[PDB]
Design a protein around this ligand. Structure first.
Ligand SMILES: Nc1ncnc2c1ncn2[C@@H]1O[C@H](COP(=O)(O)OP(=O)(O)O)[C@@H](O)[C@H]1O
Lengths: 481, 62
């Protein structure tokens, strides 16, 4: 039963996207708020199908009444909530499933005060007695942003979803959109996919019953604390955090899941922001957590470095068994030319360990990675050689020289000798820790392959999650070579 | 109410709605609306925008 619900949801929004290109994230977002009792805010220039999405959501329900109205500077409550005689509200707002209010940052104080009670209390002051309002979806679009010190900030703080719609950018998607024969005022949703009034009231009780795993709470509290330290980060109140769970719990309920999935954190990129300055900061902070602490991406990177550091420590400790013999060559030359090992070493950026560690460039080192193209010129012609420390940084100059027993001696600032050595041909302790970390990467990748098919997830975000998980698996496979 | 007659091509007749067989909509004036007002919604929906004036030729005025 729960697995069959994801098929009906994926098929319902598929018919709604017929005729609307580059608007997939705008239709699926409004459909989730219509089945959960939330709102959605639209921002952009007038003329990007901002009013068609409000009229298309009424086709998903069996009994839904639309309401398109443009708020003016001289608007009166008698034209929006119906005029009084006790109030003739036949087809207006108190008895409307989907309402659309364009340009909300210019209404009067009487209309703004009455709109706040219809969201929290879901009622309306109808003269004497009050009556409930079956408002299933509230969408408000405009063009500019309200003032930072005005009465219009109360309605903006209560709107959960905040989308910034714009014009089309793809050239292939513009040709099919410019020449569209699908009627925008028809009914392209079949009768078998339309939900009834009984299914809407039953889903509202099952939304709050979604369990909250301990792994999801560690990511919400981490993202909230990260925004409190940055001065340029937007302030997120407790109302925004509580209302975001209702949209996140319903995202997994309509996708065939019983608990909150970590993939539902991408929906917060259109709720935490509020202006142009918060758009580039919210989408950047979430992308780091989604590709770092979501599927243990960054947690496994710091754990893999400890295994590499432990493998290099065990290799430099047993370096007394394998030395480094340099063979000589004859010929006629004025300088003592030396030759390296033939088939024993063939890598270009090979690494060479050392016995007693020294202090080079005011830092410690355990292995010096040399270059095969520069080692042949120093052992024959001579001069100076370069080399990076710990396989990182720039190729710094070292005090490399030959020894009496055909060995390489690296000196520092105190004239301390150190014989170099090459690593031999995997210990049991390193293989045990690498096998446990590889099993955790396969278990984390299996969870992403079982929840990425969500309808409320953008398509371009899937390329970054897969690339972040493959980079961790590619680094752990190189250490076991 | 004028915005619904162009997109939806209907009219709220109390309870039920009926289609409007509007074939041509012409709107004339004299001045231009404000750049930040509610009248910009109808101007953005009007496709053809013509700027008519008086006659300038001497033979056409006689
Ligand atoms: N990005 C888009 N993709 C597909 N169709 C669009 C798009 N933007 C506008 N349209 C089409 O233009 C028509 C009029 O849109 P309109 O209501 O003027 O948009 P807005 O409400 O943003 O001004 C609609 O029927 C819609 O099908």
């Amino acid at each position: 039963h729960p697995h069959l619900l994801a098929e009906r949801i994926s098929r319902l929004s598929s018919s709604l996207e017929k005729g609307l290109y580059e608007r997939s994230h705008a239709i699926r977002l409004c459909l989730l708020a219509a089945l959960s009792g939330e709102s959605v805010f639209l921002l952009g220039p007038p003329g990007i199908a901002k009013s068609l999405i409000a009229r298309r959501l009424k086709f998903a329900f069996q009994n839904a009444r639309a309401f398109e109205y443009l708020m003016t500077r001289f608007s009166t409550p008698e034209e929006v909530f119906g005029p009084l005689s006790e109030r003739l509200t036949s087809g207006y707002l108190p008895e409307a499933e989907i309402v659309f209010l364009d340009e909300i940052w210019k209404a009067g104080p009487a209309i703004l005060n009455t709109l706040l009670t219809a969201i929290n209390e879901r009622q309306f002051r109808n003269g004497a007695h009050v009556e409930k309002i079956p408002m299933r979806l509230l969408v408000a679009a405009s063009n500019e942003l309200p003032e930072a010190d005005s009465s219009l900030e109360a309605l903006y703080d209560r709107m959960l979803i905040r989308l910034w719609l714009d014009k089309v950018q793809d050239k292939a998607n513009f040709r099919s959109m410019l020449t569209s024969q699908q009627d925008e005022n028809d009914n392209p949703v079949p009768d078998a996919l339309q939900v009834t009034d009984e299914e809407y009231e039953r889903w509202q009780k099952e939304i709050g019953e979604i369990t909250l795993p301990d792994h999801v709470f560690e990511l919400i509290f981490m993202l909230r604390q990260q925004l409190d330290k940055l001065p340029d980060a937007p302030y997120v109140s407790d109302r925004r955090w509580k209302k975001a769970i209702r949209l996140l719990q319903a995202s997994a309920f309509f996708s065939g899941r019983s608990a909150v999935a970590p993939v539902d954190l991408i929906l917060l990129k259109d709720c935490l922001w509020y202006d142009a300055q918060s758009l580039n900061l919210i989408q950047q902070q979430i992308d780091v957590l989604m590709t770092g602490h979501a599927w243990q991406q960054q947690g496994m990177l710091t754990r893999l470095g400890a295994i590499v550091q432990r493998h290099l420590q065990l290799q430099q400790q047993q370096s007394d068994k394998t030395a480094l013999t340099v063979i000589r060559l004859g010929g006629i030359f004025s300088r003592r030319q030396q030759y390296q090992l033939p088939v024993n070493v063939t890598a270009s950026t090979l690494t060479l360990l050392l016995q007693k560690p020294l202090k080079l460039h005011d830092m410690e080192v355990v292995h010096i990675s040399f270059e095969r193209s520069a080692l042949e010129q120093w052992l024959s012609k001579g001069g100076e050689i370069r080399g990076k420390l710990n396989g990182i940084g720039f190729a710094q100059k070292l005090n490399l020289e030959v020894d009496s027993a055909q060995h390489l001696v690296v000196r520092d600032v105190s004239l301390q000798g150190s014989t170099l050595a090459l690593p031999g041909s995997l210990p049991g302790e390193i293989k045990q820790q690498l096998e446990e970390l590889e099993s955790d990467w396969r278990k984390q990748h299996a969870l992403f392959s079982e929840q990425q098919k969500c309808l409320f997830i953008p398509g371009d975000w899937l390329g970054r999650i897969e690339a972040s998980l493959q980079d961790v698996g590619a680094q752990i496979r190189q250490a076991q070579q």
